[PDB]
Every structure is written in C-alpha cells, then in structure tokens.
C-alpha cells in the first residue's frame, strides 16, 4: 500500500520466547517479514537450486510455496508495496546477480573480480524504496572487494565501494531502526570480532567499523580479551574461520548471540552486554541458554517484523541446528518459566 518508513524505535526486550507432500532438501534458511506476516525462505535442490518461501509453521509442500529467483546465494525483503529478491547464478568465475521485483526479473549485475560472487544470505531492509544490499567478490580468506548496491523499484540508484575500517565482509544480517540500518556479519579472513556497517538511505551513504564489546561472538574465537577493540581486528582461534551471526545494538538494549563452544559450532547463547556500540570494557548481563552444548548449531540471523501493530519493532532471531528455531520475546523477564 505505502512504502515503509523507519520511524518507530527499538524498545527494550528482556527474555526471548518460542515462536517456532513432504519436505525438500532445505539449506541456508532465513526469515523475511511482509505486511501479511513473516515467511521462511530456503534454498532447495529441487544444478537448479532455487529459493522457496513458505508461511510460518507450515511444512514446505508444493501447494503453499512460491519461488523467488534461481541461484545458490540470495537475499530478499519487502518495501511495503513490492518484494525485492536477489539471486546469484552462473559459473563460479562468471557469476551474475539477477534481481526480481513483483515476480519478474528487472536487473542483472555482473561480477567484478570473478571469484564467487556472494550476497548477505539474510534479509534486507527497505526505507522509502531504498533497499541496500551488500555484495562481496574475491578471496574468502584474504582481501576481497565489497560493494553496496542501493535498489528502488527494482532499479539501481547507487553502487558504492566499502568504506571504514572493515577488512572482510561476508553473509551479513541487517536490521533497521530510527531510519538507520545496521548490518553485522562475519570476518572470514582475519578478525574474530564482527564488523558493523551503518547505512543511511537519507544521505545515501554508509560507514564501517568493528564491535567494541569484549565479548567475542564468532566461532572459532579465543578467550574473551580484557579490552575488546573496535578499530583493529582480533585474530585467533582454530580451526573454524568464522560463522555468520547477528547482534542488536540500541545502547542499553543490546543483544549478542554466539555459540557455546569457542572452537566448534555447538550450542547457542545470548548476552545483553550494555552499550555494545562503543563500550570496550563492557560485560554481559541477562544470559539465556537457547541451545545446549550437546547438539549442533549453525548460521544464526536476525529479522524484525516492522509491520507489527505496536509502537516498537520487537526484534526476533533464528538459529539453525537439520531444523531451525525462530525466537523472540517481550518485556517479560527471565526466570524458571523461560526457554
């Protein structure tokens, strides 16, 4: 009906809550919001990998599903009137990105380094038609070229090179608040602390830096240092180079989710570390055990149902295991009644 406007703020959340003719081989599943509610997107094998999106709760069956675009890396979100999807298809050295708007292709973007073009593999954020998308091309264990592409009505308005102090950017998760978008993701090459990118679609610009929190949120990682730095990356850990995650940052209303093990993708916990944006000596408060150390975890992402009938946005998250869990709660406070 009307283009979405990021005006409602992000109020405090205390404790997380449970929200989550056959199934296909679904891998890399994320969640995307729309005026009708929330849907789950996943890549399925049917050489012909395709995205399939289904309603919350319902099992993936060939009666309530719809394909967005064809590829192996992808992203998608909504702007209030239409849904914008991006997929990457083609050979590894000649990858091309196809953009779909209201179910038909509208734009093709070619590669610029020719070494596996990839996207954020999560949801995107749309503000008054401007929908930033972060893409990367090049080595996954060295310097790579990262660009930010701004879409509107399925058309390009600006492609700009990455700025700031970020060194490696892959598979990012973005959330919008107060008109500004914050994207948190993986440093696959050197750092063990996640970078953060601030995007302003008003002035049509972005800036990049790191997280100042001393609580590292990547796997693998070393023991948490005394003074987490947000200008230069912190290197360590073995053998895993990194894992996709997320982080909500609203000063005192901050949440960081990380695997239990410092070397393996086992378990999942969260911490309310106050002032995750700037504080270097910050320490966590509210703990909540989401996934125990016994079973395996995977890629974790963040999504917000901006079209809620509330004065807030009520952020939410998902963690993979295989199956996955989508969780988010309210001001109700932690206790023996929470899981």
């Amino acid at each position, epitope marked *: 009906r009307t283009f979405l406007n990021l005006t409602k703020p992000l109020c405090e959340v205390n404790s997380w809550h449970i929200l989550s003719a056959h199934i296909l081989v679904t891998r890399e599943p994320y969640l995307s919001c729309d005026p009708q509610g929330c849907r789950m997107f996943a890549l399925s094998q049917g050489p012909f990998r395709a995205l399939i999106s289904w309603e919350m709760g319902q099992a993936p069956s060939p009666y309530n599903t719809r394909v967005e675009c064809i590829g192996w890396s992808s992203t998608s979100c909504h702007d209030g009137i239409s849904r914008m999807s991006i997929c990457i298809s083609g050979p590894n050295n000649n990858a091309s990105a196809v953009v779909w708007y209201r179910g038909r292709p509208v734009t093709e973007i070619p590669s610029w380094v020719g070494n596996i073009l990839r996207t954020q593999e999560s949801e995107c954020v749309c503000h008054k038609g401007i929908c930033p998308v972060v893409m990367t091309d090049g080595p996954a264990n060295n310097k790579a070229a990262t660009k930010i592409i701004y879409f509107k009505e399925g058309k390009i308005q600006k492609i700009e090179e990455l700025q700031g102090n970020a060194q490696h950017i892959e598979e990012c998760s973005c959330y919008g608040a107060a008109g500004m978008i914050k994207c948190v993701c993986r440093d696959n090459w050197k750092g063990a602390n996640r970078p953060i990118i601030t995007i302003d679609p008003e002035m049509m610009t972005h800036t990049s830096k790191y997280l100042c929190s001393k609580i590292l949120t990547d796997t693998s990682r070393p023991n948490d240092p005394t003074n987490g730095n947000c200008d230069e990356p912190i290197t360590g850990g073995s053998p895993d180079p990194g894992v996709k995650g997320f982080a909500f940052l609203d000063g005192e209303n901050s949440w960081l989710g990380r695997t239990i093990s*410092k070397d393996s993708r086992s378990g999942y916990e969260m911490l309310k570390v106050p002032n995750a944006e700037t504080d270097t000596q910050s320490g966590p*408060t509210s*703990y*909540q*055990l989401i996934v125990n*150390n016994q079973n395996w975890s995977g890629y974790s992402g963040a999504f917000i149902d901006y079209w809620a009938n509330k004065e807030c946005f009520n952020p939410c998250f998902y963690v993979e295991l295989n199956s996955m869990v989508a969780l988010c709660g309210s001001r109700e406070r932690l*206790g023996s009644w929470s899981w």
Partner: antibody, heavy 129, light 110 residues
Framework: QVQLVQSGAEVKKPGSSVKVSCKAS????????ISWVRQAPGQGLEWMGG????????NYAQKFQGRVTITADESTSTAYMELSSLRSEDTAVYYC??????????????????????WGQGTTVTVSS | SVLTQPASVSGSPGQSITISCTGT?????????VSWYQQHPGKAPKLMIY???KRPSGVSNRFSGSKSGNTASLTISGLQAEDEADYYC??????????FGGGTKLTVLG
C-alpha cells in the same frame, strides 16, 4: 576425557589455610558454573560454594560464609578454593563440579539451575597435629 | 534448612523401591529443581536424575522421578543387580544455594 582434575591428598595443621585447584579439560570457562562440594567420611555430601566467572558472581553456603573463598583464573581456566582458620573437623573430601548456566538476571533469582552434571575424582584433606 | 531422607531402605530383587525426600517450601516446593545422585564407595557421585523427572545421557530406565507438594520421590522398578549405593536428594533454594539431603544407604544382599 577426565574433564576435571583437582590435585591429590593433603594433610594440614589446624588453624592454617587450605587451597585446592580445579582445572577443566579445555582452557576456557565460557558459560560453565563451577561448584565446590564437601563430603565427610561415610556420612554424606555438603554443598559449600559456587562461582560463575563470566559474570564474576560468587555464592557461598550459610554455614561457610566468611570462611570459604572461591576465585577463578580464566588465563589457565583454574578455579581456586580456599579455607581459612582450619579446624580438626575440616578433614573430608572436596570435589569440584561443573554445570551449564541457563539464565542470569539480577532482579529475579539469579544463577539458574546448572546442576552437577560433571564431577571430579576428589581431593582428600586431613587435619591433624 | 536441611532436607530429610528416611534413613536406609532395602528390598529383594524384582521389587520396586521408593526413596522420599521432603524439605521446606522455599527450596523444594517452589521450584522444580530437584536432582538425585548415586555414589559408590571410592567413587565420585553421579548425576542419576536431573530436572525432577529427566534422565541424563544413558541411565537405565529403572530410575524414575516424581514430585508431590514438598516431597520428591525416586522409584526404582525391578532392582536388578548392583544398585546398592548411597542415594542423595538435592534442591535449589531461593538464595542461589544448593541443599543436599542426609543420604540413604540402599544395600543388596548376595
């Protein structure tokens, strides 16, 4: 595979201070709560103390308040447990146990149920003259 | 406050034995955080039952747990061979402290 190794037996004079160590299999206390339990010879167990190093919170039993001190060193992932003013009735077996923290919040009851799902071989302490 | 156990119970093989542990309302009745441990002479205690009526990795099905008021009950159906040991009940209190029961000696003749 041993998870926790404490030390070994020890005999101490009355009135002194005893210090016992607990080291995890991995050199990291990520979210594990380390408890310290005591067992008298042939009577039963007795919960003595607990520590959460991630939030740095130390809790002691009612009887042992002001006498038992539990500290954590994340550099070597070593939990130190100390008694002062040892008496002749302090001869027992001290064990260090580990548990998985579930939730933590200051207003509500903190230090959620983490149990005793992992134990150690034990450390015998004997007080004599 | 210290929880209380009967004293010592025993029976013939093929029978079911129930061990009861009662305390106060602020430690046992309020929270479903009662655990059960078994200990053999010269061996460290093992977490037999956690979360009132849940079993850890392994553990024979013969061990079962139940709760009623301020009473926690452990039932062993068909005491088979060597369950003779010292059994203890533990509870979590409102003051972030753990309380241990007196202990029960389950002895099996040969």
């Amino acid at each position: 595979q041993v998870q926790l190794v404490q030390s070994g037996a020890e005999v101490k004079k009355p009135g002194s201070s005893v210090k016992v160590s607990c080291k995890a299999s991995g050199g990291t206390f990520s979210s594990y709560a380390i408890s310290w339990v005591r067992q008298a010879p042939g009577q039963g167990l007795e919960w003595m103390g607990g520590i959460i190093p991630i939030f740095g919170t130390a809790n002691y039993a009612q009887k042992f308040q002001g006498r038992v001190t539990i500290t954590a060193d994340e550099s070597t992932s070593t939990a130190y447990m100390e008694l002062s003013s040892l008496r002749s009735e302090d001869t027992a077996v001290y064990y260090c146990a580990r548990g998985q923290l579930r939730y933590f919040d200051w207003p509500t009851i903190p230090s959620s149920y983490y149990g005793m799902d992992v134990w150690g071989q034990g450390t015998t302490v004997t007080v004599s003259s | 406050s210290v929880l209380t156990q009967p004293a010592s119970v025993s029976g013939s093989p093929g029978q079911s034995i129930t061990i009861s542990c009662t305390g106060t309302s602020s430690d046992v009745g309020g929270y479903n955080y009662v655990s059960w441990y078994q200990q053999h002479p010269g061996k460290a205690p093992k977490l037999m039952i956690y979360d009132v009526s849940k079993r850890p990795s392994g553990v024979s099905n013969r061990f079962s747990g139940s709760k009623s008021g301020n009473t926690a009950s452990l039932t062993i159906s068909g005491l088979q061979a060597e369950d003779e040991a010292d059994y203890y009940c533990s509870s979590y209190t409102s003051s972030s402290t753990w309380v241990f029961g007196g202990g029960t000696k389950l002895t099996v003749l040969g």
